[PDB]
Write a protein that binds this ligand. Structure first.
Ligand SMILES: NC(=O)c1ccc[n+]([C@@H]2O[C@H](COP(=O)([O-])OP(=O)(O)OC[C@H]3O[C@@H](n4cnc5c(N)ncnc54)[C@H](OP(=O)(O)O)[C@@H]3O)[C@@H](O)[C@H]2O)c1
Ligand SMILES: NC(=O)c1ccc[n+]([C@@H]2O[C@H](COP(=O)([O-])OP(=O)(O)OC[C@H]3O[C@@H](n4cnc5c(N)ncnc54)[C@H](OP(=O)(O)O)[C@@H]3O)[C@@H](O)[C@H]2O)c1
Lengths: 284, 284
């Protein structure tokens, strides 16, 4: 019995589709905040349960009798609130007698300068307190954050504008990260282990721009700018202030080597990784 | 304005008595679960407020307008519950706009084999997420845990019985640890810093027994035993099972070097440390 929180979200939806290739739908439980959004899952053989991280009682019920739990992190912007939610989740899983928990954390968190990394470490320590056999799935930033349909704005202008400088990026796709979680949940050998699930073929924004140029046939350059120019760029392109700030801070951190370390853990878990060109062409 | 949680507890009571030597009672707020227990504090000039870690709303009210908060950890035996409580506390302090927070953690936590160390690390990361200027007061085990009026049972029998083997102990008194917290709250220079507040004159249970012999005039030896012999010893001396287990696990960890690392941080903060003989004679 494998339960997946965040099941209607992007990552959780992909996990379930990967689990559906490995186990009967019978064994999969989707735990979800909005039960009406989960109908398509229930049309597949997947059991749907209500579980809201803000409501301990819902989590008690949702985790009842689950063997393996994949706890996908909350997306909230308030990190201090996210620590409460995650704590509620961990306490509910302990009380429910969950037998194995996997948690989607953040690669190389101890060296991060992004405050969200402190949430993932707080949560990993919270899970260690339960004594439940664990797998810490320490996910890179998503390649999809940087490479998406929004790249058409850059083809248009001839420029990818960021404040990442020549920082290196070890991102991987949500889909490879979903496969990794599904792999771990469906095979032995991953108990009490941490994996830093990142690329071993990192890239730069110069390189991304050369790739976009090759694919589109149109000349695009990386235009690196300052933090304040980025946030301005973003706000004036219709990106709401808090998210524009979040985004500039992620690029700023990249410029300082936040995403520059690599591991073979993911490749060892899922096999060959998707080349960035292949992801760029899909995005377009 | 300096607020102290756990104010009717042993450590918090001593902190307030130390703060009373440094600031008018006007500026001190005792935050407390049981308001009737705090009357003696209110007879001094100290403001009493209700704050229960299980009740977010109480904490919102209790932390209103406080400048500096000393968050003394919860004593609960359920570590997973303690993570929820501590998270509630941290979120309340962020919401209340607390300007500086000190938290009593556990020295060298990253190297601990005691599960309570994961709670203190989860909490430190929770505090880092708030961005509030912090002081992590990483307290050694209390010398008072080992050296107390209970040593008369050992004088009686001629033996201190433990499963600590010849493990080394860097413990310090609750009172020195209270002085350290009070010092930090009342002088500049301690913002965004962690201190491992332990002894630089560690001791063994052989040594404790020689000291008890010198003080009492009666011959007492350390009798080191196994984990299961300890727990049995303890249970049959009227120590309730969960606490007997807690105690055997603390000694077991000592036997494996849990308390063997030292730092000059405390001595640098408070001046000379209390010799163990002086603490033994007080206990008796
Ligand atoms: N590594 C990265 O680059 C990266 C980037 C962004 C996010 N993340 C983290 O990884 C997680 C998964 O990524 P994603 O792309 O799948 O994000 P996503 O599409 O935003 O999914 C977030 C999921 O969490 C659910 N959720 C929100 N609040 C909840 C609550 N109170 N109780 C229960 N569920 C709640 C959402 O439910 P609804 O559908 O009902 O709203 C949604 O299913 C995110 O939650 C976030 O913490 C990582
Ligand atoms: N370093 C060590 O060797 C060591 C040893 C033991 C404990 N500790 C930790 O350090 C802390 C202080 O040590 P201590 O000797 O002063 O312990 P203590 O005498 O047991 O004090 C614990 C304090 O926390 C309060 N408390 C319990 N539950 C609470 C709640 N739900 N909301 C608000 N307050 C609550 C208690 O209030 P009441 O008086 O109303 O019950 C008490 O004032 C402990 O909480 C524990 O986590 C450290």
């Amino acid at each position: 019995s494998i339960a997946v929180t965040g099941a209607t979200g992007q990552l959780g939806g992909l996990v379930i589709q990967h689990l559906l290739k490995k186990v009967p739908a019978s064994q999969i439980i989707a735990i979800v905040r909005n039960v009406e959004k989960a109908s398509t899952l229930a049309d597949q053989g997947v059991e749907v349960r209500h579980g809201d991280y803000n409501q301990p009682e819902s989590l008690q019920k949702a985790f009842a009798g689950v063997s393996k739990l994949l706890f996908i992190s909350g997306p909230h912007y308030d990190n201090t609130l996210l620590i409460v939610q995650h704590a509620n989740v961990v306490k509910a899983a302990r009380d429910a007698g969950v037998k194995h928990i996997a948690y989607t954390g953040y690669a190389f968190a101890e060296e991060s300068i992004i405050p969200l990394a402190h949430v993932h470490l707080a949560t990993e320590y919270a899970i260690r307190t339960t004594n439940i056999p664990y797998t810490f799935l320490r996910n890179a930033l998503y390649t999809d954050f940087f490479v998406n349909e929004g790249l058409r704005a850059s083809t248009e202008s001839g420029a990818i504008v960021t404040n990442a400088g020549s920082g290196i990026v070890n991102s991987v796709t949500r889909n490879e990260l979903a496969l990794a979680a599904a792999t771990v949940l469906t095979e032995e050998g991953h108990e009490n282990k941490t994996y830093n699930l990142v690329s071993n073929q990192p890239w730069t924004f110069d390189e991304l721009a050369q790739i976009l140029s090759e694919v589109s046939g149109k000349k695009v350059v990386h235009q690196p700018v300052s933090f304040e120019e980025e946030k301005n760029f973003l706000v004036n392109a219709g990106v709401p202030e808090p998210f524009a700030e979040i985004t500039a801070a992620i690029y700023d951190a990249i410029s300082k080597g936040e995403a520059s370390k690599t591991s073979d853990d993911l490749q060892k878990l899922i096999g060959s990784l998707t080349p960035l060109k292949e992801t760029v062409k899909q995005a377009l």
